[PDB]
Design a protein around this ligand. Sequence first.
Ligand code: AMP
Ligand code: MG
Ligand code: MG
Ligand code: MG
Ligand code: ZN
Length: 247
Amino acid sequence: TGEMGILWEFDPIINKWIRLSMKLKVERKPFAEGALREAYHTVSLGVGTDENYPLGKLFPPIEMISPISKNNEAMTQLKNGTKFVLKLYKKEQQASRELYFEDVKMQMVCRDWGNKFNQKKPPKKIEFLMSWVVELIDRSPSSNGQPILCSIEPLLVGEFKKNNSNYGAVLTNRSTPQAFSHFTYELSNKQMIVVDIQGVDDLYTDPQIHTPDGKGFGLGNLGKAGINKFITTHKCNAVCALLDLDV
Ligand SMILES: Nc1ncnc2c1ncn2[C@@H]1O[C@H](COP(=O)(O)O)[C@@H](O)[C@H]1O
Ligand SMILES: [Mg+2]
Ligand SMILES: [Mg+2]
Ligand SMILES: [Mg+2]
Ligand SMILES: [Zn+2]
């Protein structure tokens, strides 16, 4: 029968969240997992407005929410019938409400970096998937009393491959993922780096940002230690050279 959700989309260019609703039907058991999360096949039963579900203390704070939601990615990318992916944290105690929003914002920040990288006209352009926060409002808060939240994103079709980790592993020999990571480090004045570059070909998802202070950007932000680990194993390649990155 499916279930209702409040759907949150972040738009970096206005620095506001957009609040919508959707109906979805998720499989009972996950098809894959990572260190922190499990992934579930889901189907959209339609996207709508949040008009029927008022009040949305409060996080995000009201000043961070657009009162207008007419323009959004969800209504096309998650339209009725769309197969997509829902992710839950594994059995959690470290997962506050704010964390879910932090994760989704992080992926949106990485989309901005992908666009910036693409403006350099690299041999292979890249793209990060949209991600959204969903509040599964039909579910009981079967824990300490906290509502059930998750993130959702489009389904990747094809061979899912991880190219680097968030702690120095270089897992494939492809240039583009490693050059992108290096690009983010140099162009951010070493104030962040995007790693955990993974997905199907150059369509990526669940990246991870490190910043020197390790603040924000989720549980996987390993700070200077994570940045240095990337450096220890990074070998510049043909794409690094084309982008004139510091050797
Ligand atoms: N958008 C996606 N489409 C298909 N498979 C995915 C997607 N995101 C993650 N996966 C798979 O689910 C696992 C865990 O996802 P994550 O928690 O994002 O690392 C990954 O290692 C992939 O095998
Ligand atoms: Mg993974
Ligand atoms: Mg991550
Ligand atoms: Mg952090
Ligand atoms: Zn390099």
